[PDB]
């Protein structure tokens, strides 16, 4: 048994692509992220999503846009996709001016807080660091 995917629309795809960071953070500019953002745009267009690209948002702007997007009526949509491209730590992504908790962004879409997405797949795709450990690997 599987999710109903034949609503009138597949849903939103929100791509938040943060490349350039305030000197206050001491985070370096994420060269190459623009290629990822473009590639995700065509990928999810071809999957019949309504794709919105956002670039270099502060943490305040990330919170505002995600709360806004959670207040829209998704009744005609099958799903929701959010793609975050930024620096991060465990449980954290970076706005251009600092960290936000992942939970802060996703809690907007909880089954009880976004009622037009209850019962529907909510995908978050996070390209960001989850800490500083390094995987040496092993020869097969």
């Amino acid at each position: 048994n599987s999710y109903k995917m034949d609503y009138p629309e597949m849903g939103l795809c929100i791509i938040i692509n943060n490349k350039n960071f305030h000197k206050s953070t001491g985070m370096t500019s994420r060269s190459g992220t623009d290629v990822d953002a473009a590639n995700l745009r065509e990928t999810f267009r071809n999957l019949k999503y309504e794709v919105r690209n956002k670039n270099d948002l502060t943490r305040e702007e990330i919170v505002e846009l995600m709360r806004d997007v959670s207040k829209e009526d998704h009744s005609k949509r099958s799903s929701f996709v959010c793609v975050l491209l930024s620096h991060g730590e465990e449980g954290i992504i970076f706005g251009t001016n600092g960290p936000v908790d992942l939970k802060k962004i996703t809690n907007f879409f909880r089954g009880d807080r976004c009622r037009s997405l209850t019962g529907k797949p909510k995908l978050f795709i996070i390209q960001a660091c989850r800490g500083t450990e390094l995987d040496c690997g092993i020869e097969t």
Partner: protein, 92 residues
């Protein structure tokens, strides 16, 4: 008839918990490269979890870091699929 408020999320992370994530300065991050590729190849063919397992395999086997620092040289990466979904997901 209730369902959990945390139900029906899926978190597709680029890397395992506690780890660096790796990015090529010209082509983009290993994860998004691999995800986009596997979505183009398999979206009409495979359930989404299976697509994400192809992405895991692609990043695990095809990519390796370069650094002049021995600490950061020849390092690997494995994405982390976290599924609270209750049903299968096909894009076709």
């Amino acid at each position: 008839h209730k369902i959990p408020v945390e139900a029906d999320f899926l978190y597709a992370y680029s890397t395992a918990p506690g780890y660096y994530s790796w990015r090529n300065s010209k082509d983009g991050s290993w994860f998004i490269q691999s995800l986009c590729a596997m979505l183009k190849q398999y979206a009409d063919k495979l359930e989404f979890m299976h697509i994400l397992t192809r992405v895991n395999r692609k990043v695990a086997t095809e990519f390796e870091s370069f650094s002049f620092d021995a600490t950061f040289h020849a390092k690997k990466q494995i994405p982390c699929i976290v599924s609270m979904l209750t049903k299968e997901l096909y894009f076709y």
